[PDB]
Amino acid sequence: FRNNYDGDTVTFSPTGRLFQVEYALEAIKQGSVTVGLRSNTHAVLVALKRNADELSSYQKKIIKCDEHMGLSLAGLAPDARVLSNYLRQQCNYSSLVFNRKLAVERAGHLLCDKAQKNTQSYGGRPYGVGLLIIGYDKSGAHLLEFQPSGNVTELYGTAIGARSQGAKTYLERTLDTFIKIDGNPDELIKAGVEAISQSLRDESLTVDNLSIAIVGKDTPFTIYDGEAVAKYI
Amino acid sequence: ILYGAPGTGKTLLAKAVANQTSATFLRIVGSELIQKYLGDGPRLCRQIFKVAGENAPSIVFIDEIDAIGTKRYDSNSGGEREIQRTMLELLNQLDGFDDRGDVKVIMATNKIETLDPALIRPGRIDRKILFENPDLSTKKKILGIHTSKMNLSEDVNLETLVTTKDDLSGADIQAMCTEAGLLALRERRMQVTAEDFKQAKERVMKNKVEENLEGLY
Amino acid sequence: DIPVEILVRRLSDIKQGYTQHGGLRPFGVSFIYAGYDDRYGYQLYTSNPSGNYTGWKAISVGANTSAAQTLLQMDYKDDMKVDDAIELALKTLSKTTDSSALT
Amino acid sequence: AGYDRHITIFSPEGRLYQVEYAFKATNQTNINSLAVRGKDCTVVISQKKVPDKLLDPTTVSYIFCISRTIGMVVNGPIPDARNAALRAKAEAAEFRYKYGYDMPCDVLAKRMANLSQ
Amino acid sequence: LPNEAGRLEIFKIHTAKVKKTGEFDFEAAVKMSDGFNGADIRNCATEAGFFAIRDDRDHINPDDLMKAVRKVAEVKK
Amino acid sequence: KPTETYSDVGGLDKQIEELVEAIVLPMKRADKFKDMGIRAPKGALMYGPPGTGKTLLARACAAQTNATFLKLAAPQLVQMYIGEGAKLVRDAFALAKEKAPTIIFIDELDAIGTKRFDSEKSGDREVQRTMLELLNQLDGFSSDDRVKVLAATNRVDVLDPALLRSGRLDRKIEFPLPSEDSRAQILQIHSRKMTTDDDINWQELARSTDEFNGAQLKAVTVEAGMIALRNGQSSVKHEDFVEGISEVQARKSKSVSFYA
Amino acid sequence: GYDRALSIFSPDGHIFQVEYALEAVKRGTCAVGVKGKNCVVLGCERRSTLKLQDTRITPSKVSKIDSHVVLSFSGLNADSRILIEKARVEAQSHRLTLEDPVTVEYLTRYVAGVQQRYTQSGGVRPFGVSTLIAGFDPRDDEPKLYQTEPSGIYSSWSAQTIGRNSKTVREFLEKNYDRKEPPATVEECVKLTVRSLLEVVQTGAKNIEITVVKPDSDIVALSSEEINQYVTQIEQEKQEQQ
Amino acid sequence: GSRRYDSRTTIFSPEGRLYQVEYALESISHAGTAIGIMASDGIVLAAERKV
Amino acid sequence: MTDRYSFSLTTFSPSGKLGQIDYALTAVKQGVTSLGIKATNGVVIATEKKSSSPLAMSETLSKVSLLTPDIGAVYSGMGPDYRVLVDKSRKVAHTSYKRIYGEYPPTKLLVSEVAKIMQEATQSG
Amino acid sequence: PPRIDPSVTMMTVEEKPDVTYSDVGGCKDQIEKLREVVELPLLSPERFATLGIDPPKGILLYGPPGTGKTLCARAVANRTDATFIRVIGSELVQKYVGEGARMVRELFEMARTKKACIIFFDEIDAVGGARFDDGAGGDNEVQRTMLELITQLDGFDPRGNIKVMFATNRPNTLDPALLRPGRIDRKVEFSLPDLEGRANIFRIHSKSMSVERGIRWELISRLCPNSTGAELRSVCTEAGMFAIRARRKVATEKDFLKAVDKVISGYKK
Amino acid sequence: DRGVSTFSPEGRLFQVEYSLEAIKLGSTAIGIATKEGVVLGVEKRATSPLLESDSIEKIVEIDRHIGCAMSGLTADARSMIEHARTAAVTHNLYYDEDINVESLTQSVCDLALRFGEGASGEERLMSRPFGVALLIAGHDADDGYQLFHAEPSGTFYRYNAKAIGSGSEGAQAELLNEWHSSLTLKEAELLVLKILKQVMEEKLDENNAQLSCITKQDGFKIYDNEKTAELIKELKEKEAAES
Amino acid sequence: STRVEGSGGGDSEVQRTMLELLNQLDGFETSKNIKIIMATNRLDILDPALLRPGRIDRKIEFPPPSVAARAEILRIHSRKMNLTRGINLRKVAEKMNGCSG
């Protein structure tokens, strides 16, 4: 029964969606929590990184895809690599072929097709990892939500990962405030830190845990990692 | 659990142990529990266990469970329901009442791998007993007993028959005693000669020992 | 001329191949190979559905293999001639038939 | 194998379930058709039912013009009818170029038959 | 299953016995309907009327009927 | 008297309207239907999940009209002895006519709703005959709403061309997978029963719950209450639900090992 | 084309096909290997259910990869042939490219590698045979015995047995070998191999086959009488009394 | 599904035999008899024509 | 994304029988009567042409086909299987014995190509 | 006052079972849930009342039968002073028209009269389980039993007195109506025990046996393949068989290792 | 049957979890990284007097600055190593410098997710994830001595101490307390020997245990049976003198 | 005149039961005076452990019908009733081929 509709990717169920899509969706939440916010001039991503142990250390999950483009993941590390590699080729071609910095809208639609295609086989699979893809081109800053189902929505702020809603409600409140803070790297970073804390309810907020990433009007893709987020706490 | 071939060790071993301990030996026909009705298999199975506990001590020998079994891939299936029903009652009856020594169960099947691995259940069935093949020396031993009960000629040599036999189980050895002895009964004689045995050894040997070139390597 | 021992191996490897890879059925066939070399004299092989092949100096395959072979083992003798072998084959053939007498 | 309710093979009754059910629903367009021959002509008369008044009738056809001379009436469900029409029209067009000659009814028939088998 | 001609006849009788606006069009309904039987055609008469109780009147309109017939049509083949 | 209310359910609103139109509006304004000359149903069919709020609303309609509620369970009718069930149904209807306003509530309509389609109906003739007997009776009268019969299935797998007709099972009401707005309302019904500390953020929880049926929602609430007990509280807070959803009781789980 | 899977990972951790492969080794032939200081002997018992064969037009159970490398097996004939074919191409290939015959270690890696690979891809399942690979490296005299199994695992052993009734003869080796003294006498290495197979074959001393590999293309099948001579000697040992 | 039509009957068993192979050995016993005699002067081949 | 299937549709059964082939033996039985007589002085083949609507014609049907000019063939079993097989059989006979030769194929040799085709379709899923 | 009765039922009743937990190492999790759902509402109803919740009516315990799953059921009944009622689900399914439905009503009424009691259903695979036939003249009969059983649960029943604890060997072929809340609220998972788990369950059996004193079960656990609680007990008694076989009073680590080696191979399929 | 696209209701595939069970059916493998050097230790094991444990090894060289210890199905890691070496050599050709331990772990992990029955974006050249886990340790002159845990899942973690295998829970706990970055190369080895003996069900001697080290003066060097033995005596004597 | 030649239901299973009984008699009581005779036309009701000596010990062929045999039977049945002496059972027997008793 269950095993019919999990064991095949070239199926559908009576609800209007296959069970595998419900599990992939669950898997994004199984990621660690990350928020994204923009005012449409700059876009910031603030991310809580957990590491397995005191004897592990942090490994990167904010990915420079170009010097004007990046992503954060939440969900499955193996899959995230596959997607990141794709977006990176895609960024490179856009520069070589068109002199473009690539809009999110164009990138999302292309990532969608590949995903679709691998549900059009046995032994291909949805990614089961979500991404907040940011970049600063000529229509400004942009924040997209990509899901491995192929749903692409641009949101002004959002969250993915466990307890998305905590930051999201804070974001729907502070909305009107942040969108009129235009042109400020530092005001928005401060916001991101404030936001991520409304997600938390079973996790600690510490310097080494937190990680910030920016691209914006006068900033090409630069990451603050480790030490360098202390002064925004 | 005893698994081999019936009346070669599997039937016999359970019969022996029953004689030693003065226990009632209860021979349970696996198949008759395969009734074509519903409700019917489990209450037949239950009745067998009821009577076993009442009239302890007893060894319960359940002959050739595979007709009520068949593992499948699922623990209930859209095929026949009656075969699945008797199987789950049988699994619940080991799993749910345990005995020290008052009732002992001997289960029989030709292939132990057609049984569900949870119907085997460690902590009741601890022993899993399998069947070795006779070597030359065992053939001599098994033969010696069967001839004690015969009367025969003294030109019959045990050693000679045994060497030329190769890969016969004890069942074939028993058949030989009867077949050579049958030629004596045809010649109206209650000895058996050397000659009867040779022809007998050869014939059962031939039929058992069919070649298909699946040996060798 | 091809050696027998090689030619047999190429068939057996092929049979073997189908059941390992391709999802295929294997062939349901046994061959008894009769061939000559000046490195070995006459050679006689048999190959069977598992991809296993062996040499025999007298062999039976098909219905009633066991029984034929048992008769073969007694009547066999180190000394040979063709016309003697023709008699041998026929004596046996008559006694392995699953139908009365022989024609 | 062990399957015949998920894949298509010979029946032991000898009447193939997939072929029989294909014989049955075709009628899901509410059609009835005939074709007759006159001495010099061949006429087809065919039903049409229009199930909405958001629909134009003049784009609703069950006759597809294969070439210039050849006609084909499909009785079936229309996504399958059209699928065959697309394939038939090209094979007809391909034949006409290669062989210098307009496709026979029977040859078109035979070729689509052998493919369905 | 009834003719086209048969649908028109069965509709006539079932909306006859129901109260209605003075202008009415049986024919309109008849085209849209396929795969119905007499019980299905009666239901269409009654379906239109439930929405007329809703609309605070005794009178089916051709307008109720157009909805009624398409809904009965949607819920099945 | 069932004590069910429409305040015990919510966000099933569009489906509340259809049921009320089908059985209550004929009862109350019988002279209006009569005078029009349209047949008024005497059966309704509901399908969907029971306990989401399909079953609750039936009981609620009966209470509101102050009809006699009679629960007849379909496996009960199915006797191994020669027609008991057909007989039970004619008595079921006769007593129903006497008792009016009445809702004859039939749990399960796939238990008798198999009847086979081959020559296999021979065996299972008790189940075909009982189902046929209620439909012949329903069509044997019209334009009255003295008896209502309302049918419920655990999971729909049965529907027939025979069920159709207005005096038979006219109404086909679907009760869906709840929308987001609706889950929050169901939670706020459920949490009425809870002792709250009034810190619970309704909006957030409703979005986070995805693929939950009304009964499953109830399961989160008892779990949250259960956590609160271990924590040493007599009331619950918002965090207690967030924690609650993640837990296994509805096929939703969490995991780790996908991150560094 | 085709590439649907036949290898499916077990919740055991030990794949189905590997575990069912090992069964195939137990049914098959019996092979044992003993190393000297100067030899490596590979013994096989012959089991002919009926014999109408000759021993010279049957394929023999110790098979040459090279003039000075042998491979010996237990399991099915069919599978082992495939492993052999691939190894004879590899033998020649090293000879062509490095200008030197194979090292034994590389060859062992190779036979393992094909097995391991058929566990890992779909569409192929792995082989029903375990092998004894022995030989000598260029400029060398020290014996090498390695054991390869269908899991694709290999390791070195001073003595080993595989195939039918492995247990009995393993124990027999545990009490009849020395690690401060692998025998440097060719005669005692053959002796031990004959004792081992004797205890299993049932009858017949010309249903025992020894193959001796000494350095520098010396692969030698010892003849009937020589074999009889150790068997005589083993009954003198067994019917010893003081 | 493609693998949901597959049965994998080409693989080693729990007894370590190959289903389809064992079945082929059977086939050969239901077909005619074939006998091969090798002598050092010739080879005599017979195969039995049934039906 | 498809054409990755090659698992067989003809398998061994526990009586070592072949599933499809048992099924197909019926199909032949449900056919109509066809015969052959070799007189040594020729060959005669005859069959019943029968058809599946009264409005159809069996005068404009054919159940003997020319394979090559000098050879004709007839069958019992199913109409669809016969048409595709005759076409493939007509193809190989032209290509391999009139482009490589010029004499029309000996009979037996043509039988061996038809046989190879049918068995090939049984091996391969 | 004669309203609601046992009628005539066929059942196996054990007032206060003689069985206590003997697996706590892999069934730490089934015990934590169990305690809370059954033991504490019976021991203090008032707590639940103050929260504003009433506990689960039915709980499903799944995974392999008898690996401490069965033990946990008997154990909680003893601990609460409630009647333990073992019904074998497969016996309550009958061919006979309704014979099956009738049997089911009488059991729940019986339960009501005698309330504060645990109905343990061994096997719901029988009672429901897979199909595709959707009645067939033998999967109708089964469906009729399944459906009647649902009717009592989803109707009017006490959730604070009557517990039903269900046992299965696979919940993936069971109908969504058997699974869903409104009938089974908590569904608890069996865990094959971890190395540390094996040690505690071992430690229990080795409150008997003259094992060497200084034994490290953790070391033995690391060489072990996977095992279930049934298997860990199984090893211990088989090790004692080696001690008698060799005619010696005391047990070593070694006797336990030798028993592992044997039992796992024997198991497999 | 089964497929390989199947998720669990969590959303984590079946085969991946089953791969973690296989790692635990390996033997304990311990790596500790300290200021100077990385130490890697394995149990060679010796189960028979006839087994040559002193002719085999379980600590394999990737490059002249990168080693690895494995636990699991040790054949499955031959494919992985072979691929890593090919990558490692290719970087020495392409830039003339050391290959980062991290850049490599990433490369290797990409092909651990390459299991499937064919899909339209990627090559599949395995059916199933490897039965085998790695500890890869190395040195580069960009971030010095490092240790990484390479999963068959394809996740990659940076560490300082890690144990894998059956006893990894007990060994890792002890390690957390002992780990300091003020421990000399020799010290790290001695503390590794003490723990490795504990988790062992049999006596610790050279004939069943192997040490190996990574120094930036001479790279990955697999330590001799003799040198490791000498310290085992010294461990035995100190330990039996605080008792 | 007798329906059912054995089937997949209860005729083959019942045939197993009988064999069991026979084992038991040579067991405790070692008295055995009641013998069971099986008759069959088909080898698909049989399995090799069933033919294995100690369940079924003798497999006896029942007379396949020959011309000489057919005359004999006829002569015995004719020796009850009024038939002419001018008849030749050799003719009547030779006329019949593919006829049982």
UniProtKB/Swiss-Prot annotation, chain B:
Belongs to the AAA ATPase family. This is 26S proteasome regulatory subunit 4 homolog. The chain holds residues 220 to 436 of 437 of the full protein. ATP binds at G4, A5, P6, G7, T8, G9, K10, T11. There is a cross-link at K15, K36, K71 (Glycyl lysine isopeptide (Lys-Gly) (interchain with G-Cter in ubiquitin)). It is found in: Cytoplasm; Nucleus. The 26S proteasome is involved in the ATP-dependent degradation of ubiquitinated proteins. The regulatory (or ATPase) complex confers ATP dependency and substrate specificity to the 26S complex. Has ATPase activity. Changing K10Q: 73% loss of ATPase activity.
Curated annotation (Swiss-Prot), chain I:
Keywords: Cytoplasm, Isopeptide bond, Nucleus, Proteasome, Ubl conjugation. Its main location: cytoplasm. There is a cross-link at K108 (Glycyl lysine isopeptide (Lys-Gly) (interchain with G-Cter in ubiquitin)). GO terms for cellular component: nucleus; proteasome complex; proteasome core complex, alpha-subunit complex; proteasome storage granule. It is found in: Cytoplasm; Nucleus. It comes from the Eukaryota. Disulfide bonds: none annotated. GO terms for biological process: proteasomal ubiquitin-independent protein catabolic process; proteasome-mediated ubiquitin-dependent protein catabolic process. Present with 7060 molecules/cell in log phase SD medium. The 26S proteasome consists of a 20S proteasome core and two 19S regulatory subunits. The 20S proteasome core is composed of 28 subunits that are arranged in four stacked rings, resulting in a barrel-shaped structure. The two end rings are each formed by seven alpha subunits, and the two central rings are each formed by seven beta subunits. The catalytic chamber with the active sites is on the inside of the barrel. The proteasome degrades poly-ubiquitinated proteins in the cytoplasm and in the nucleus. It is essential for the regulated turnover of proteins and for the removal of misfolded proteins. The proteasome is a multicatalytic proteinase complex that is characterized by its ability to cleave peptides with Arg, Phe, Tyr, Leu, and Glu adjacent to the leaving group at neutral or slightly basic pH. It has an ATP-dependent proteolytic activity.
UniProtKB/Swiss-Prot annotation, chain J:
GO terms for cellular component: cytoplasm; nucleus; proteasome complex; proteasome regulatory particle, base subcomplex. It comes from the Eukaryota. Keywords: ATP-binding, Cytoplasm, Nucleotide-binding, Nucleus, Phosphoprotein, Proteasome. The N-terminus is blocked. One of its GO terms (biological process) is positive regulation of RNA polymerase II transcription preinitiation complex assembly. The modification Phosphoserine is found at S44. Its main location: cytoplasm. ATP binds at G63, P64, P65, G66, T67, G68, K69, T70. GO terms for molecular function: ATP binding; ATP hydrolysis activity; proteasome-activating activity; ubiquitin protein ligase binding. It is found in: Cytoplasm; Nucleus. Interacts with UBR1 and CIC1. The 26S proteasome is involved in the ATP-dependent degradation of ubiquitinated proteins. The regulatory (or ATPase) complex confers ATP dependency and substrate specificity to the 26S complex. Present with 105 molecules/cell in log phase SD medium. Belongs to the AAA ATPase family. This is 26S proteasome regulatory subunit 7 homolog. It comes from Saccharomyces cerevisiae (strain ATCC 204508 / S288c). The chain holds residues 188 to 456 of 467 of the full protein.
From Swiss-Prot, chain L:
It is found in: Cytoplasm; Nucleus. N-acetylated by NAT1. The 26S proteasome is involved in the ATP-dependent degradation of ubiquitinated proteins. The regulatory (or ATPase) complex confers ATP dependency and substrate specificity to the 26S complex. Present with 4700 molecules/cell in log phase SD medium. May form a homodimer or a heterodimer with a related family member. Interacts with OLA1, TMA17, and UBR1. Belongs to the AAA ATPase family. This is 26S proteasome regulatory subunit 8 homolog. The gene is RPT6.
